[PDB]
């Protein structure tokens, strides 16, 4: 008998992020997985992935150049932070 | 008999991030996994991944260049930090 | 009889990050794993990973160059730090 | 009979980071593992990993250069430090 | 009968980082492990890892150069240090 | 009968880092281990690790150069030091 009980009696007003999981039992392969339940990706780069079988196999002249040079600003006040009875502000 | 009990009686208003998991039982392979339940990726780079079987196999002239040179600013006030009855501010 | 009991009676308003896990039982391989439950990756780089079987196998002329030279600023006030009845501020 | 009891009665408002785990029982291989429950990676580099079987096998002329030279600033006020009834500030 | 009891009665508001684990029972291999429960990696470098079987096997002319020369500043006020009723500040 | 009891009655607000573990029972191999429960790595370098079986096996002309010469500053105020009713400051 598997019994899982989470946050059953709540009185008041909290801030929650519940993640309950119960399990009873050619280049990239994945199986039976739970990924990115509460994930966050900011300014994330992937230039060359899984190009394929036999890419640039013979006599390949290639110049890979990657220039990440910029005036980019990211300002997050409450990233993944539940809060109760509080004050959150970004003042520029 | 498996019994798991988490945060059953809450009185008041907290800030919570619950992650409850119960389990009863060609180049990259993964199986039976739980990844990035509460992950965060900021300014994350991946230039060449899993290019493939036999890439650049014969007579390959290649110049890999990666220049990460920029005025990028990241300011996070409460990254993954639940908070109760508090004050959070970013003042620029 | 397996019984796990976590934070059952809470009175007041705390700040919590609960992570409860119960288990009853060609180049990169992984199996049966729980990774990055509360992970954080800031300015993380991966230039060449898992290029593949037989990469640059014969007569390969390659110049790998990686220049990470930039005016990047990262300022985190509460990184993975739940807090109660407090004051958090970034003042620039 | 396995019984695990953690933080059962909490009165007041603390700041907690609970990590409870209970277990009852071609180049990189991993199995049955729990990694990075509360990990943090700041400015982390990995240039060449798991290139593959037979990489640069015959007559390979290669110049690996890695230049990490930059005006990058990282300022973290409460890294992985839950705090209660406190004041946290970054003032530039 | 295995019984583990941690922080059962808490009165007041402390700052805690609980890590409770209970267990009842081709180049890199790992199995049955718990790694990086509360790890921190700042400015961590890995140039060449697990290149593969037979890398640079025959007649390989290679120049490995690694130049880490930069104006990088890291300032952490409370790294892995839970604190209660305190004041934490970085003033530049 | 194995009974482990840690920090059962806490009155007041301390700062704690609890680590309770109970166990009842081709080049790098590891098994049955718990590593980096509260680890910290600052400016940590690894140039060549686990290159592989038969690397640079025949007629290899290689120049390994590693130049770590830079204006890098690291300032940590409370590294792995929980503190209660205290004042922590970095003033530059």
Author numbering:
A (entry chain F), B (entry chain E), C (entry chain D), D (entry chain C), E (entry chain B), F (entry chain A): 11 to 35, 57 to 123
Lines from the paper:
To investigate the relationship between mutation, disease manifestation and fibril morphology, we have determined the cryo-electron microscopy (cryo-EM) structures of several ATTR amyloid fibrils, which were isolated from the amyloidotic tissue of patients with hereditary ATTR amyloidosis. Based on cryo-EM, however, we find essentially the same fibril structure in all patients, demonstrating that the mutations do not necessarily lead to different fibril morphologies.
She suffered from carpal tunnel syndrome and severe cardiomyopathy and cardiac surgery was performed six years later. For the three fibrils we obtained spatial resolutions of 3.18 Å (V20I) 2.37 Å (G47E) and 2.99 Å (V122I), based on the 0.143 Fourier shell correlation (FSC) criterion. The most abundant proteolysis sites occur between residues F44 and S52 and thus within the internal disordered segment of the fibril protein. The internal disordered segment is not seen in the 3D map, and it is partially cleaved off in the fibril, as demonstrated by MS. All three fibril samples contain both mutant and WT TTR protein.
